[PDB]
Amino acid sequence: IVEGSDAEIGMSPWQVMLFRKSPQELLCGASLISDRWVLTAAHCLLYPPWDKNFTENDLLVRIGKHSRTRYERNIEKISMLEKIYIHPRYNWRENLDRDIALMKLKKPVAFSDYIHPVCLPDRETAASLLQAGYKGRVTGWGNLKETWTTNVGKGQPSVLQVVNLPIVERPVCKDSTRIRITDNMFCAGYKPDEGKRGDACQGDSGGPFVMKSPFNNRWYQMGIVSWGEGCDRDGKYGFYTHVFRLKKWIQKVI
Amino acid sequence: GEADCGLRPLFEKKSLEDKTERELLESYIDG
Amino acid sequence: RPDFCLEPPYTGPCKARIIRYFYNAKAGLCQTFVYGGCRAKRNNFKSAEDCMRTCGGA
Known about the structure:
The complex is a heterotrimer.
Chain A: E1 5-6, E2 15-20, E3 26-32, E4 37-40, E5 60-63, E6 77-79, E7 81-86, E8 101-105, H1 123-129, E9 135-140, E10 161-166, H2 170-174, E11 185-188, E12 208-212, E13 219-227, E14 238-242, H3 243-253
Antiparallel strand pairs in A: 1-10, 2-3, 2-5, 3-4, 4-8, 5-6, 7-8, 9-10, 9-12, 11-14, 12-13, 13-14
Chain B: H1 21-28
Chain C: E1 18-24, E2 29-35, H1 48-55
Protein name (chain B): Thrombin light chain
Function (chain C): Inhibits trypsin, kallikrein, chymotrypsin, and plasmin.
GO molecular function, one term (chain C): zymogen binding
């Protein structure tokens, strides 16, 4: 998360960490939506085609964490994945459309002050909240600055970062990139003139983009961190998977 | 489960508000 | 020495943090870079071994 800030303890009890020791190559976020299901981006589970690997597992889902590096004993829980379901129409070498993936945990997790599921949006919520100018929250352990290897100053955060960004008008998203966006994704972030910065960056993908309903006091997952050209660039915005438009697939699979 | 999804133990259930939460509410009231 | 070994490492638009290896032609050795999860260019290897076997010299 670029230009974000340290989250407080228990701020996002639905934040899940996708980690892999060997190859270390993995850090992605995910969201806890039930005691047995985690939601992430389809691209965090794939490999380049010349790898020829399709087993997809050996990954650890660490739930309840705050610190990126430290092991949190009586707080975090590590679980194994029983099954992984990637949207059969996710397209990388194409539109980057339908970047969504669900994961069934081996055994259901047990909630606590640090672990708790987010609500998924319903027609009404989608209508009330998904409006240009309306702010959402993005959390993650990803890079603090745009980086291809190493960067100046610190690079990765020690604790979960949070940043609240505004949903941007579709036309503006459309005119901000050459990649053909689809109704299944939305963009958020500040415009250059709004004197505020913030963005998701490498390591944040899969994490949740949430909004609090001013009507029922509940947090809803409206998007999933997916892509963006760089991190926190002027005139550029981050794109998120439109959870509401994929809600039916989520339901069907579960 | 879903029944009480979205209500964070250390916050909503305690009638506590995190430090930047209101910035979100403000943007809904004409943002 | 395939042409794609001379190309610089490409992270891409996606935001995952996938540590990978690329052939650094200028140094003549394979190094790690952060790949984003999508739109991988070919100089993107699972391991240094695979990296060297495919790009050893370029």
